[PDB]
Structures are given as C-alpha cells and as structure tokens.
Design a binder for this molecule. Structure first.
Ligand SMILES: *C(=O)[C@@H](NC(=O)/C(=N\OC)c1csc(N)n1)[C@@H]1N=C(C(=O)O)C(=C)CS1
Length: 347
C-alpha cells in the first residue's frame, strides 16, 4: 500500500548523531515518488572545511555487487549464462570444486573464503598495504584458495568478496569486454547516471566528492584520509563511484522492472536467510523494517565511506544515506536508522 510520510526531523537527528559519533559528514536523499528530501550535516573535507552536500560523489563499496549482479542477470536473459551451471564450466580449472554454481557465488552460498579477512586484520596497516596496489582477478581468487572452503556448495550463507571477484571474471570472459564497458553500456548510459563511474585502477574520484576518513582500531586515534586508492582489492565487488541521486535512480529502476526480465528479477529476490530481519538474494539485500515493511538494495563499506542504498518493493521510494567514515560501528548502526525514518516515518 502507500508508505507513511518520510520523517525529515528524524532523519536530521540521525545525521546529527552520526556526527557526534565520529563521522565528519553525513547526508541522505529520499526520492519519494517525485518529491525529493535532502539533508546533510558536517564536512566533506575535515581539513579545508568544505561542507558535505547531497550532490557530492563517493565510493559505494559493496553496493557495486548489485551492479555486477544486474549485468550477469542480463547475460542470463540473453542466453549466455545459466545460473545453475558450474562456475568451472565457464572458467575451467578456477575452483577446486565443480559443484559450486554461478547461483551459489551470487548469493554467497559458495563456501569461498573471503581474502579481505587476511588483508584488513589491522585496518590502517591493511589499507596502507593495498591502497596503491593493482591486482588481477586471478590474484584475489588465489588468495581465497589458500584457505579451504568454509562449507559445502550451497550449504549456507557466508558473505565473501571473492564471490563477486569471480562475478567480474565471469562477465569479462562471457562478453570479451572489461567490466567497465559492461557497466557503462548496460547500466550507466541507459539510466543516464552521470555521477556513476568505475575507473579502476585510477585513484582519483572525478568531480566534487566527499573525502573518506578511515577510523583507526585504537580508541581516540587520529583519522586517516582514505579517499584516494585503487580499490583493486575489491573491483567488481566494490569499486563503483556514485551519488545519492544515481543510486536512488538505479535501485528504483531495478525494483520497478526496467533492468531485466521479470523472470530474472524474481530470481534475484530469492532470499537466503541472513538473520531475523535480513535476507540476501543475488547481489541484493532485503532489510525488514520495524513498521512491517521491507526495503531492497545494498549497503557498502569501503575505507572511509558507509553507504545504505535501499528502495521499496515497487521502486516508488528510494533512499541513499552516506557518512564519510568507516571502521566505526557506532556510526554504522546509527546510519541504518535513516531507513526507519525514510520509510516508516514519524513514530
Ligand atoms: C562491501 O562493502 C564489503 N565490505 C568490506 O569488504 C569491508 N571492508 O572493506 C574495506 C567491511 C565489512 S564489514 C565492515 N565494517 N567492513 C562487504 N559488505 C558488508 C557491509 O557492511 O555491508 C559486510 C557485512 C560483508 S563484507
């Protein structure tokens, strides 16, 4: 049915709170079926003092998985990929088990160890070690394969970045084009997303952007500017750059059925249980809100940025919130509240 009115004061309180908890800046945009809501507080660059705004560009991290999933599902629509075929069928000798399918990799049921557990054990030293490095898809898979699988094929949900590194490799193999070209042609261009880029391995964010600040592991540590990095450790799992308006457009288009066939969208929303209030389909998350409504989209965490991009079942209302800091669980939990205010409204 019709959603309650978004609560702008509640949203203001959420942003203000994230600022009191360590986030230099924070903002949220709500596209409510043609009526826009925009709020922001804090700075985009804590050194120069520039204010953050809802037009600022940022790194979306893991939200990138929805972009990748959309490309793969279109490939299914075209007859080039079968979700239930072995990953080894399309990429011979890649994985140690032929029973792991494309569907399992897309929904995090493959058992592949997540190599970031090795890279970022120590947050700051980990970021300094990989920020300027360029990795191939093979490099990452091989890092994952040094460890055994964590469960039998399809047996259980376990989030792993590796799954979407494999996703990127699949896209390039089946199409013969880089993933950048694929995103541009199938998603960016058609949707006219002018603030959305996949520039890997470039370290600059084009145009006006919010800088990201990595919180150190030690309490009271000085913030580290993490804005410029290759994001080569994530690639098809988390290197997309976008804006609130573009992510709002992308998720509203996805949910209203404009990015693929109805048959594939239903496949994408085939939920594996994550916990009591969350689900994961094919590169898509479901969050159950307190007022009894569910939102669809994805979260993203990459050094210096926390992103929440969700939309209603029909795509009529979409929301993108962003705080420019990471490795701060208080800011992470607080920002999730923009969802309650935006979709559930005034308590
Ligand atoms: C997506 O963004 C990805 N995030 C990471 O790999 C993380 N660090 O990257 C520098 C990360 C995981 S949780 C955290 N505080 N940092 C995946 N996305 C999430 C998410 O928070 O949305 C995960 C829970 C799994 S890893």
């Amino acid at each position: 049915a019709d959603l309650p009115a978004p609560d702008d004061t509640g949203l203001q309180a959420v942003l203000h709170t994230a600022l009191s908890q360590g986030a230099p800046g924070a903002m949220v945009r709500v596209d409510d079926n043609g009526t826009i809501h925009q709020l922001s507080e804090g700075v985009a660059d804590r050194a120069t003092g520039r204010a953050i705004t809802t037009t600022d560009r940022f790194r979306v991290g893991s939200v990138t998985k929805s972009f990748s999933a959309v490309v793969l599902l279109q490939l299914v629509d075209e007859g080039k990929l079968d979700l239930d075929a072995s990953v080894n069928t399309y990429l011979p000798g890649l994985l140690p088990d032929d029973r792991i399918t494309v569907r399992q990799v897309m929904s995090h049921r493959s058992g592949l160890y997540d190599y970031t557990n090795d890279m970022f054990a120590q947050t700051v030293p980990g970021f300094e070690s990989v920020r300027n490095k360029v990795f191939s898809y093979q490099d990452l898979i091989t890092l994952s394969l040094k460890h055994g699988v964590t469960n039998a094929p399809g047996a259980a949900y376990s989030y792993s970045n590796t799954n979407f590194v494999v996703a990127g490799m699949l896209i390039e193999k089946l199409t013969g084009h880089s993933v950048a070209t694929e995103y541009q042609n199938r998603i960016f261009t058609p949707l006219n997303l002018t603030d959305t880029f996949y520039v890997h391995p470039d370290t600059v964010i084009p145009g006006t952007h919010a800088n990201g600040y990595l919180t150190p592991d030690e309490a009271g540590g000085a913030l580290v500017d993490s804005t410029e990095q290759t994001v080569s450790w994530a690639q098809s799992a988390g290197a997309v750059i976008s804006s609130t308006q573009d992510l709002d457009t992308f998720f509203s288009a996805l949910m209203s059925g404009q990015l693929m066939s109805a048959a594939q969208l239903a496949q994408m929303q085939q939920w594996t249980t994550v916990n009591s209030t969350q689900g994961y389909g094919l590169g898509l998350r479901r969050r159950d809100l307190s007022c009894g409504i569910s939102v669809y989209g994805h979260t993203g965490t990459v050094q210096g940025y926390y992103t929440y991009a969700f939309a209603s079942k029909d795509g009529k209302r979409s929301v993108t919130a962003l705080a420019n800091t990471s490795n701060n669980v208080n800011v992470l939990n607080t920002m999730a509240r923009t969802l309650e205010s935006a979709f559930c409204g005034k308590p």
